[PDB]
Write a protein that binds this ligand. Structure first.
Ligand SMILES: COc1ccc(S(=O)(=O)N[C@@H](CC(=O)NCc2ccc(C#N)cc2)C(=O)N2CCC[C@H]2C(=O)NCc2cc(Cl)ccc2CN)cc1Cl
Ligand SMILES: *[C@@H]1O[C@H](CO)[C@@H](O)[C@H](O)[C@H]1NC(C)=O
Ligand code: NA
Ligand code: NA
Lengths: 251, 28, 11
């Protein structure tokens, strides 16, 4: 996260760290959506241009974390993966269209003060909140700058951007399955996700029921926090039919 | 689940985090 | 660099 701040304890209890077994290292962010299911970006697991194609046994998920590097004894819980599901129409070739994946844990995780699931939006909440100017929150342990790394979880609040502005910021073909967020050059304030924040949640707090909803997944950006560029997020609601199909069929 | 999106250390205790008001204020 | 995690999780 670029130009963010340290998270408060328990501020994002759905935050998950995707952790490589060997060598032991951060792979990505992710989020907890139930006691058995974790949501992330497909490119965290499958990205052929970089020779990335992880299998279940390659990975761990660490839940309830705050420190990036410490083993947080008595607080974090570490889980093995039963199965990975990647969206069948995930477009890693062109533009990361449908950049979404689910991971089923081998065993349910116990909720605590530091571990708790985020809500997924229904159609109405998506329609109400996914509007230009409305702000969401992005969290992660990724790089602090494009070109170092944080001691603890970072947080930044960012406004959703008008679709035509998103489109005009890039040569990449944008789709309805993405939205973009970030400040404009003229707005002064700044901030963005960066490398290592991939797969983490873009969340919004509903003013209707005071619950946090995951509206986006950290997907891509041309660099990090560049003027005139924006961060692009997987549109969780647009892909929810797939999410529900996977959970209903395999869980 | 029934309890999704309500944080034990915040919503469940009626405590606010330091910047959530920024989000609320943007929801015009 | 990361603090080592309990071996039980690597098994
Ligand atoms: C297959 O689809 C893509 C393939 C590449 C790129 S990209 O080159 O623009 N960004 C890529 C890689 C990158 O940043 N190259 C360094 C770079 C520096 C300057 C410019 C300019 N002008 C362009 C690229 C990226 O974000 N990728 C490639 C695969 C994973 C994803 C990623 O890093 N996501 C994390 C992320 C997420 C968000 Cl929301 C914001 C920033 C970032 C970090 N760039 C976008 C798409 Cl949609
Ligand atoms: C990635 O890994 C799987 C299984 O190891 C393999 O079958 C597949 O062909 C690879 N490439 C993909 C899914 O694009
Ligand atoms: Na364009
Ligand atoms: Na920018």
């Amino acid at each position: 996260i670029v130009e963010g701040s340290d998270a408060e304890i328990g501020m994002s209890p759905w935050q998950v760290m995707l952790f490589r077994k060997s060598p032991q290292e951060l792979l990505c962010g992710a989020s907890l959506i139930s006691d058995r299911w974790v949501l992330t970006a497909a490119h965290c697991l499958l990205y052929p241009p970089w020779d990335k194609n992880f299998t279940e046994n390659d990975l761990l998920v660490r839940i309830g974390k705050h420190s990036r590097t410490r083993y947080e004894r008595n607080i974090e819980k570490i889980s093995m993966l039963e199965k990975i599901y990647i969206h069948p129409r995930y477009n890693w070739r062109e533009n990361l269209d449908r950049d979404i994946a689910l991971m089923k844990l081998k065993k349910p995780v116990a909720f605590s003060d530091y571990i708790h699931p985020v809500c997924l939006p229904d159609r109405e909440t998506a329609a109400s909140l996914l509007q230009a100017g409305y702000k969401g929150r992005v969290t992660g342990w990724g790089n602090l700058k494009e070109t170092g790394q944080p001691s603890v979880l970072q947080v930044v609040n960012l406004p959703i951007v008008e679709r035509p502005v998103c489109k005009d910021s890039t040569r990449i073909r944008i789709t309805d399955n993405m939205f973009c967020a970030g400040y404009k050059p003229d707005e002064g304030k700044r901030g963005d996700a960066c490398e290592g924040d991939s797969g983490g949640p873009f969340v919004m707090k509903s003013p209707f029921n005071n619950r946090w909803y995951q509206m986006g997944i950290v997907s891509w950006g041309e660099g990090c926090d560049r003027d005139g560029k924006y961060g692009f997020y997987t549109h969780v609601f647009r892909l929810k039919k797939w999410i529900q199909k996977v959970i209903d069929q395999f869980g | 689940e029934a309890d999704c999106g309500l944080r034990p250390l915040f919503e469940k205790k009626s405590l606010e985090d330091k910047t959530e008001r920024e989000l609320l204020e943007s929801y015009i | 660099d990361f603090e080592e995690i309990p071996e039980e999780y690597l098994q």
